[PDB]
Amino acid sequence: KVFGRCELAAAMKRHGLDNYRGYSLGNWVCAAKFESNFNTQATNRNTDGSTDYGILQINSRWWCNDGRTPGSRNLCNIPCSALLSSDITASVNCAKKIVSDGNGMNAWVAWRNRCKGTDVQAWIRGCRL
Ligand SMILES: [Cl-]
Ligand SMILES: [Cl-]
Ligand SMILES: [Cl-]
Ligand SMILES: [Cl-]
Ligand SMILES: [Cl-]
Ligand code: NA
């Protein structure tokens, strides 16, 4: 599914991401934008053999099982495929574990390089939330 911007902001808010670990909604929307372009089916293979999955490009090295990342963990206790669903619940629940792990949203390199310190509220501007 390719979400609309305000559509995704609404689903993220419903699932409790607005101000989760102190990160305003626009942070999460901006991160999604630059990670996946709002496409729940996004995948990206990394050089290390791990893969990033879904709207927030969650990585198989730590967070989900794809059966093909030697030495990896599955800290969200999910098949990585669950992160490609049109329903964002698995992505959001797993995001919440990640962002709690000590580095906040810096865990998402694109958030650090493209969102951090920008006017992230622009990402939720106009949305009926
Ligand atoms: Cl915001
Ligand atoms: Cl594996
Ligand atoms: Cl959803
Ligand atoms: Cl939680
Ligand atoms: Cl933080
Ligand atoms: Na894994």
mmCIF file of all heavy atoms in Angstrom, residues 14-54:
data_model
loop_
_atom_site.group_PDB
_atom_site.id
_atom_site.type_symbol
_atom_site.label_atom_id
_atom_site.label_comp_id
_atom_site.label_asym_id
_atom_site.label_seq_id
_atom_site.Cartn_x
_atom_site.Cartn_y
_atom_site.Cartn_z
ATOM 1 N N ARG A 14 -2.977 6.891 15.486
ATOM 2 C CA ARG A 14 -3.884 5.904 16.060
ATOM 3 C C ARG A 14 -3.134 4.824 16.830
ATOM 4 O O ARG A 14 -3.569 4.349 17.890
ATOM 5 C CB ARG A 14 -4.759 5.265 14.981
ATOM 6 C CG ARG A 14 -5.698 4.237 15.618
ATOM 7 C CD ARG A 14 -6.887 3.998 14.753
ATOM 8 N NE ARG A 14 -6.448 3.292 13.582
ATOM 9 C CZ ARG A 14 -6.107 1.989 13.558
ATOM 10 N NH1 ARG A 14 -6.184 1.170 14.652
ATOM 11 N NH2 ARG A 14 -5.701 1.488 12.400
ATOM 12 N N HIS A 15 -1.987 4.398 16.289
ATOM 13 C CA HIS A 15 -1.171 3.370 16.890
ATOM 14 C C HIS A 15 -0.134 3.896 17.914
ATOM 15 O O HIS A 15 0.718 3.141 18.376
ATOM 16 C CB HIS A 15 -0.430 2.604 15.795
ATOM 17 C CG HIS A 15 -1.306 1.776 14.930
ATOM 18 N ND1 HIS A 15 -1.779 0.549 15.310
ATOM 19 C CD2 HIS A 15 -1.794 1.995 13.693
ATOM 20 C CE1 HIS A 15 -2.504 0.033 14.334
ATOM 21 N NE2 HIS A 15 -2.530 0.891 13.342
ATOM 22 N N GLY A 16 -0.244 5.165 18.277
ATOM 23 C CA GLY A 16 0.433 5.701 19.463
ATOM 24 C C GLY A 16 1.853 6.160 19.190
ATOM 25 O O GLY A 16 2.620 6.323 20.128
ATOM 26 N N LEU A 17 2.184 6.469 17.938
ATOM 27 C CA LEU A 17 3.514 7.056 17.648
ATOM 28 C C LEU A 17 3.759 8.529 17.902
ATOM 29 O O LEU A 17 4.919 8.936 18.056
ATOM 30 C CB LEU A 17 3.904 6.816 16.182
ATOM 31 C CG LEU A 17 4.581 5.519 15.914
ATOM 32 C CD1 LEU A 17 5.010 5.553 14.420
ATOM 33 C CD2 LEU A 17 5.835 5.146 16.755
ATOM 34 N N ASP A 18 2.701 9.376 17.880
ATOM 35 C CA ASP A 18 2.814 10.859 18.143
ATOM 36 C C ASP A 18 3.330 11.032 19.564
ATOM 37 O O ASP A 18 2.730 10.565 20.534
ATOM 38 C CB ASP A 18 1.474 11.634 17.964
ATOM 39 C CG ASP A 18 1.608 13.189 18.083
ATOM 40 O OD1 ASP A 18 2.727 13.754 17.983
ATOM 41 O OD2 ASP A 18 0.536 13.865 18.244
ATOM 42 N N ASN A 19 4.478 11.678 19.639
ATOM 43 C CA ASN A 19 5.294 11.789 20.836
ATOM 44 C C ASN A 19 5.832 10.560 21.558
ATOM 45 O O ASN A 19 6.317 10.640 22.704
ATOM 46 C CB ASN A 19 4.741 12.874 21.731
ATOM 47 C CG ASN A 19 5.281 14.212 21.283
ATOM 48 O OD1 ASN A 19 6.482 14.564 21.542
ATOM 49 N ND2 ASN A 19 4.489 14.892 20.467
ATOM 50 N N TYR A 20 5.920 9.429 20.833
ATOM 51 C CA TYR A 20 6.464 8.259 21.410
ATOM 52 C C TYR A 20 8.008 8.473 21.617
ATOM 53 O O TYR A 20 8.708 8.932 20.700
ATOM 54 C CB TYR A 20 6.206 7.025 20.560
ATOM 55 C CG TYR A 20 6.556 5.778 21.300
ATOM 56 C CD1 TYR A 20 5.586 5.072 22.048
ATOM 57 C CD2 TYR A 20 7.838 5.236 21.236
ATOM 58 C CE1 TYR A 20 5.930 3.921 22.748
ATOM 59 C CE2 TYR A 20 8.199 4.114 21.980
ATOM 60 C CZ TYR A 20 7.249 3.468 22.717
ATOM 61 O OH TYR A 20 7.607 2.355 23.386
ATOM 62 N N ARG A 21 8.494 8.164 22.827
ATOM 63 C CA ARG A 21 9.862 8.487 23.277
ATOM 64 C C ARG A 21 10.197 9.987 22.969
ATOM 65 O O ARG A 21 11.357 10.347 22.766
ATOM 66 C CB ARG A 21 10.908 7.528 22.688
ATOM 67 C CG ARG A 21 11.214 6.228 23.465
ATOM 68 C CD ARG A 21 11.953 6.482 24.800
ATOM 69 N NE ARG A 21 12.397 5.292 25.556
ATOM 70 C CZ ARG A 21 11.603 4.304 26.023
ATOM 71 N NH1 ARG A 21 10.263 4.259 25.802
ATOM 72 N NH2 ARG A 21 12.156 3.296 26.697
ATOM 73 N N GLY A 22 9.194 10.880 22.967
ATOM 74 C CA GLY A 22 9.427 12.276 22.716
ATOM 75 C C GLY A 22 9.564 12.752 21.307
ATOM 76 O O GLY A 22 9.839 13.916 21.076
ATOM 77 N N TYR A 23 9.291 11.858 20.360
ATOM 78 C CA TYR A 23 9.345 12.207 18.941
ATOM 79 C C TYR A 23 7.932 12.538 18.370
ATOM 80 O O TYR A 23 7.086 11.655 18.252
ATOM 81 C CB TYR A 23 9.964 11.056 18.180
ATOM 82 C CG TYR A 23 11.411 10.900 18.488
ATOM 83 C CD1 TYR A 23 11.877 10.013 19.470
ATOM 84 C CD2 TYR A 23 12.358 11.681 17.773
ATOM 85 C CE1 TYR A 23 13.223 9.924 19.769
ATOM 86 C CE2 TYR A 23 13.721 11.544 18.046
ATOM 87 C CZ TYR A 23 14.147 10.713 19.045
ATOM 88 O OH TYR A 23 15.529 10.550 19.377
ATOM 89 N N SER A 24 7.745 13.806 18.046
ATOM 90 C CA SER A 24 6.516 14.322 17.488
ATOM 91 C C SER A 24 6.186 13.541 16.217
ATOM 92 O O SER A 24 7.088 13.011 15.511
ATOM 93 C CB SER A 24 6.629 15.804 17.197
ATOM 94 O OG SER A 24 7.583 16.069 16.174
ATOM 95 N N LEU A 25 4.893 13.467 15.920
ATOM 96 C CA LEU A 25 4.431 12.842 14.739
ATOM 97 C C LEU A 25 5.132 13.149 13.486
ATOM 98 O O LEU A 25 5.397 12.216 12.669
ATOM 99 C CB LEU A 25 2.915 13.051 14.578
ATOM 100 C CG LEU A 25 2.149 12.092 13.629
ATOM 101 C CD1 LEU A 25 2.332 10.592 13.924
ATOM 102 C CD2 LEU A 25 0.664 12.444 13.709
ATOM 103 N N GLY A 26 5.416 14.416 13.234
ATOM 104 C CA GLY A 26 6.118 14.777 11.991
ATOM 105 C C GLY A 26 7.472 14.066 11.828
ATOM 106 O O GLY A 26 7.915 13.817 10.703
ATOM 107 N N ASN A 27 8.148 13.748 12.942
ATOM 108 C CA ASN A 27 9.392 12.977 12.831
ATOM 109 C C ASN A 27 9.156 11.634 12.181
ATOM 110 O O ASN A 27 9.985 11.234 11.340
ATOM 111 C CB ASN A 27 10.116 12.779 14.136
ATOM 112 C CG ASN A 27 10.791 14.061 14.616
ATOM 113 O OD1 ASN A 27 11.852 14.394 14.131
ATOM 114 N ND2 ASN A 27 10.117 14.820 15.556
ATOM 115 N N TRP A 28 8.074 10.986 12.581
ATOM 116 C CA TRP A 28 7.810 9.604 12.117
ATOM 117 C C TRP A 28 7.410 9.646 10.656
ATOM 118 O O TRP A 28 7.789 8.806 9.864
ATOM 119 C CB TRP A 28 6.739 8.961 13.013
ATOM 120 C CG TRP A 28 7.211 8.765 14.432
ATOM 121 C CD1 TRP A 28 6.890 9.548 15.561
ATOM 122 C CD2 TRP A 28 8.119 7.783 14.878
ATOM 123 N NE1 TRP A 28 7.559 9.055 16.655
ATOM 124 C CE2 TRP A 28 8.311 7.976 16.277
ATOM 125 C CE3 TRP A 28 8.780 6.705 14.230
ATOM 126 C CZ2 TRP A 28 9.104 7.085 17.060
ATOM 127 C CZ3 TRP A 28 9.595 5.873 15.018
ATOM 128 C CH2 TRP A 28 9.767 6.111 16.402
ATOM 129 N N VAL A 29 6.564 10.619 10.318
ATOM 130 C CA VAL A 29 6.143 10.803 8.895
ATOM 131 C C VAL A 29 7.323 11.134 7.994
ATOM 132 O O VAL A 29 7.450 10.576 6.905
ATOM 133 C CB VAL A 29 4.966 11.836 8.763
ATOM 134 C CG1 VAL A 29 4.643 12.057 7.287
ATOM 135 C CG2 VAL A 29 3.751 11.415 9.582
ATOM 136 N N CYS A 30 8.212 12.039 8.439
ATOM 137 C CA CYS A 30 9.361 12.389 7.672
ATOM 138 C C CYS A 30 10.253 11.127 7.482
ATOM 139 O O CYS A 30 10.779 10.859 6.349
ATOM 140 C CB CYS A 30 10.145 13.483 8.387
ATOM 141 S SG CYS A 30 11.617 14.101 7.558
ATOM 142 N N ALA A 31 10.470 10.404 8.567
ATOM 143 C CA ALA A 31 11.298 9.167 8.497
ATOM 144 C C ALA A 31 10.656 8.212 7.440
ATOM 145 O O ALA A 31 11.350 7.719 6.570
ATOM 146 C CB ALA A 31 11.410 8.467 9.855
ATOM 147 N N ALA A 32 9.333 7.965 7.523
ATOM 148 C CA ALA A 32 8.673 7.128 6.525
ATOM 149 C C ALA A 32 8.856 7.611 5.108
ATOM 150 O O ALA A 32 9.077 6.837 4.177
ATOM 151 C CB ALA A 32 7.206 6.851 6.847
ATOM 152 N N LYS A 33 8.687 8.901 4.908
ATOM 153 C CA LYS A 33 8.868 9.493 3.609
ATOM 154 C C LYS A 33 10.223 9.134 2.990
ATOM 155 O O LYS A 33 10.296 8.624 1.831
ATOM 156 C CB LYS A 33 8.752 10.988 3.685
ATOM 157 C CG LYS A 33 9.058 11.589 2.324
ATOM 158 C CD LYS A 33 8.008 11.369 1.326
ATOM 159 C CE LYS A 33 8.444 12.159 0.114
ATOM 160 N NZ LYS A 33 7.554 11.805 -1.013
ATOM 161 N N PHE A 34 11.285 9.386 3.736
ATOM 162 C CA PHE A 34 12.615 9.176 3.209
ATOM 163 C C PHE A 34 13.090 7.689 3.194
ATOM 164 O O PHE A 34 13.908 7.284 2.323
ATOM 165 C CB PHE A 34 13.581 10.183 3.837
ATOM 166 C CG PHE A 34 13.291 11.583 3.420
ATOM 167 C CD1 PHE A 34 13.018 12.569 4.388
ATOM 168 C CD2 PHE A 34 13.214 11.947 2.054
ATOM 169 C CE1 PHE A 34 12.692 13.875 3.987
ATOM 170 C CE2 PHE A 34 12.913 13.247 1.684
ATOM 171 C CZ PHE A 34 12.646 14.209 2.662
ATOM 172 N N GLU A 35 12.480 6.878 4.057
ATOM 173 C CA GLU A 35 12.759 5.454 4.084
ATOM 174 C C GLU A 35 12.084 4.710 2.959
ATOM 175 O O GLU A 35 12.721 3.972 2.219
ATOM 176 C CB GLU A 35 12.404 4.853 5.417
ATOM 177 C CG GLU A 35 13.322 5.283 6.581
ATOM 178 C CD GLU A 35 14.766 4.797 6.532
ATOM 179 O OE1 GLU A 35 15.139 4.132 5.558
ATOM 180 O OE2 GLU A 35 15.574 5.187 7.430
ATOM 181 N N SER A 36 10.798 4.932 2.812
ATOM 182 C CA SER A 36 9.991 4.102 1.927
ATOM 183 C C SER A 36 9.135 4.831 0.910
ATOM 184 O O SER A 36 8.425 4.128 0.139
ATOM 185 C CB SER A 36 9.005 3.280 2.745
ATOM 186 O OG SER A 36 8.020 4.131 3.362
ATOM 187 N N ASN A 37 9.114 6.165 0.961
ATOM 188 C CA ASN A 37 8.168 6.940 0.163
ATOM 189 C C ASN A 37 6.745 6.525 0.379
ATOM 190 O O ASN A 37 5.852 6.617 -0.486
ATOM 191 C CB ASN A 37 8.531 6.869 -1.339
ATOM 192 C CG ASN A 37 8.053 8.097 -2.074
ATOM 193 O OD1 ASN A 37 7.761 9.116 -1.452
ATOM 194 N ND2 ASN A 37 7.888 7.984 -3.339
ATOM 195 N N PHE A 38 6.477 6.149 1.624
ATOM 196 C CA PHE A 38 5.190 5.812 2.133
ATOM 197 C C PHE A 38 4.661 4.466 1.595
ATOM 198 O O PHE A 38 3.462 4.155 1.736
ATOM 199 C CB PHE A 38 4.164 6.945 1.916
ATOM 200 C CG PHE A 38 4.521 8.298 2.511
ATOM 201 C CD1 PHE A 38 4.082 9.465 1.870
ATOM 202 C CD2 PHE A 38 5.161 8.409 3.742
ATOM 203 C CE1 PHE A 38 4.309 10.722 2.450
ATOM 204 C CE2 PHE A 38 5.412 9.657 4.304
ATOM 205 C CZ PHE A 38 5.006 10.793 3.649
ATOM 206 N N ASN A 39 5.556 3.624 1.078
ATOM 207 C CA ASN A 39 5.180 2.338 0.447
ATOM 208 C C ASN A 39 5.462 1.241 1.432
ATOM 209 O O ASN A 39 6.617 0.949 1.751
ATOM 210 C CB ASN A 39 5.975 2.161 -0.827
ATOM 211 C CG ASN A 39 5.504 0.996 -1.631
ATOM 212 O OD1 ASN A 39 4.731 0.144 -1.154
ATOM 213 N ND2 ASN A 39 5.951 0.962 -2.879
ATOM 214 N N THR A 40 4.419 0.605 1.934
ATOM 215 C CA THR A 40 4.547 -0.530 2.834
ATOM 216 C C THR A 40 5.294 -1.721 2.251
ATOM 217 O O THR A 40 5.877 -2.494 3.031
ATOM 218 C CB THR A 40 3.200 -1.092 3.395
ATOM 219 O OG1 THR A 40 2.511 -1.790 2.320
ATOM 220 C CG2 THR A 40 2.297 0.002 3.897
ATOM 221 N N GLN A 41 5.366 -1.833 0.910
ATOM 222 C CA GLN A 41 6.107 -2.949 0.287
ATOM 223 C C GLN A 41 7.550 -2.667 -0.002
ATOM 224 O O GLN A 41 8.230 -3.466 -0.675
ATOM 225 C CB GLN A 41 5.375 -3.478 -0.948
ATOM 226 C CG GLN A 41 3.957 -3.912 -0.640
ATOM 227 C CD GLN A 41 3.337 -4.699 -1.746
ATOM 228 O OE1 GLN A 41 3.648 -5.898 -1.919
ATOM 229 N NE2 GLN A 41 2.508 -4.036 -2.543
ATOM 230 N N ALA A 42 8.067 -1.515 0.410
ATOM 231 C CA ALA A 42 9.474 -1.180 0.183
ATOM 232 C C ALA A 42 10.432 -2.212 0.804
ATOM 233 O O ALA A 42 10.275 -2.557 1.971
ATOM 234 C CB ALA A 42 9.814 0.184 0.789
ATOM 235 N N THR A 43 11.478 -2.614 0.038
ATOM 236 C CA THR A 43 12.553 -3.403 0.582
ATOM 237 C C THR A 43 13.865 -2.817 0.030
ATOM 238 O O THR A 43 13.914 -2.192 -1.043
ATOM 239 C CB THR A 43 12.466 -4.895 0.168
ATOM 240 O OG1 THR A 43 12.522 -4.978 -1.276
ATOM 241 C CG2 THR A 43 11.184 -5.585 0.717
ATOM 242 N N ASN A 44 14.918 -2.975 0.823
ATOM 243 C CA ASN A 44 16.277 -2.560 0.475
ATOM 244 C C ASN A 44 17.274 -3.531 1.027
ATOM 245 O O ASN A 44 17.274 -3.783 2.206
ATOM 246 C CB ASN A 44 16.557 -1.192 1.102
ATOM 247 C CG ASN A 44 17.944 -0.731 0.835
ATOM 248 O OD1 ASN A 44 18.354 -0.717 -0.297
ATOM 249 N ND2 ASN A 44 18.710 -0.371 1.907
ATOM 250 N N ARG A 45 18.071 -4.123 0.149
ATOM 251 C CA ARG A 45 19.140 -5.010 0.557
ATOM 252 C C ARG A 45 20.369 -4.193 0.959
ATOM 253 O O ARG A 45 20.822 -3.303 0.232
ATOM 254 C CB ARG A 45 19.454 -5.932 -0.607
ATOM 255 C CG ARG A 45 20.552 -6.966 -0.415
ATOM 256 C CD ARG A 45 20.405 -7.934 0.678
ATOM 257 N NE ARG A 45 19.048 -8.508 0.797
ATOM 258 C CZ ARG A 45 18.511 -9.453 -0.025
ATOM 259 N NH1 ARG A 45 19.264 -9.970 -1.053
ATOM 260 N NH2 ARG A 45 17.261 -9.948 0.256
ATOM 261 N N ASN A 46 20.933 -4.574 2.102
ATOM 262 C CA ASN A 46 22.173 -3.956 2.567
ATOM 263 C C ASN A 46 23.384 -4.765 2.154
ATOM 264 O O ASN A 46 23.326 -5.995 1.901
ATOM 265 C CB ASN A 46 22.105 -3.819 4.058
ATOM 266 C CG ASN A 46 20.944 -2.933 4.486
ATOM 267 O OD1 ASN A 46 20.804 -1.810 4.031
ATOM 268 N ND2 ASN A 46 20.157 -3.426 5.326
ATOM 269 N N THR A 47 24.519 -4.081 2.181
ATOM 270 C CA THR A 47 25.788 -4.733 1.813
ATOM 271 C C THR A 47 26.130 -5.924 2.720
ATOM 272 O O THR A 47 26.767 -6.922 2.286
ATOM 273 C CB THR A 47 26.956 -3.699 1.843
ATOM 274 O OG1 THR A 47 27.078 -3.178 3.171
ATOM 275 C CG2 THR A 47 26.687 -2.554 0.925
ATOM 276 N N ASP A 48 25.689 -5.870 3.959
ATOM 277 C CA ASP A 48 26.016 -6.906 4.900
ATOM 278 C C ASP A 48 25.124 -8.157 4.710
ATOM 279 O O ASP A 48 25.227 -9.091 5.497
ATOM 280 C CB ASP A 48 26.008 -6.386 6.356
ATOM 281 C CG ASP A 48 24.607 -6.091 6.869
ATOM 282 O OD1 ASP A 48 23.650 -6.145 6.077
ATOM 283 O OD2 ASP A 48 24.445 -5.917 8.063
ATOM 284 N N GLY A 49 24.203 -8.156 3.743
ATOM 285 C CA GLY A 49 23.288 -9.264 3.539
ATOM 286 C C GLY A 49 21.942 -9.155 4.251
ATOM 287 O O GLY A 49 21.014 -9.916 3.941
ATOM 288 N N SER A 50 21.833 -8.198 5.191
ATOM 289 C CA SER A 50 20.574 -7.914 5.834
ATOM 290 C C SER A 50 19.640 -7.164 4.866
ATOM 291 O O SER A 50 20.112 -6.610 3.835
ATOM 292 C CB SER A 50 20.781 -7.175 7.163
ATOM 293 O OG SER A 50 21.161 -5.838 6.929
ATOM 294 N N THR A 51 18.348 -7.117 5.202
ATOM 295 C CA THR A 51 17.363 -6.405 4.341
ATOM 296 C C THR A 51 16.545 -5.503 5.255
ATOM 297 O O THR A 51 16.202 -5.884 6.430
ATOM 298 C CB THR A 51 16.509 -7.435 3.604
ATOM 299 O OG1 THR A 51 17.362 -8.318 2.846
ATOM 300 C CG2 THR A 51 15.488 -6.829 2.624
ATOM 301 N N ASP A 52 16.160 -4.359 4.703
ATOM 302 C CA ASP A 52 15.233 -3.398 5.366
ATOM 303 C C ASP A 52 13.827 -3.566 4.722
ATOM 304 O O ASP A 52 13.710 -3.671 3.481
ATOM 305 C CB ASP A 52 15.633 -1.964 5.164
ATOM 306 C CG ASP A 52 17.054 -1.691 5.603
ATOM 307 O OD1 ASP A 52 17.521 -2.241 6.620
ATOM 308 O OD2 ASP A 52 17.711 -0.916 4.892
ATOM 309 N N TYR A 53 12.834 -3.570 5.596
ATOM 310 C CA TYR A 53 11.420 -3.899 5.228
ATOM 311 C C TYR A 53 10.407 -2.819 5.667
ATOM 312 O O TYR A 53 10.416 -2.368 6.814
ATOM 313 C CB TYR A 53 10.995 -5.193 5.855
ATOM 314 C CG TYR A 53 11.785 -6.383 5.426
ATOM 315 C CD1 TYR A 53 13.004 -6.725 6.068
ATOM 316 C CD2 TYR A 53 11.369 -7.173 4.329
ATOM 317 C CE1 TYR A 53 13.742 -7.830 5.665
ATOM 318 C CE2 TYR A 53 12.087 -8.291 3.934
ATOM 319 C CZ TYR A 53 13.271 -8.615 4.611
ATOM 320 O OH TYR A 53 14.016 -9.703 4.224
ATOM 321 N N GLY A 54 9.513 -2.453 4.738
ATOM 322 C CA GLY A 54 8.303 -1.725 5.074
ATOM 323 C C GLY A 54 8.470 -0.216 5.164
ATOM 324 O O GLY A 54 9.478 0.403 4.794
#
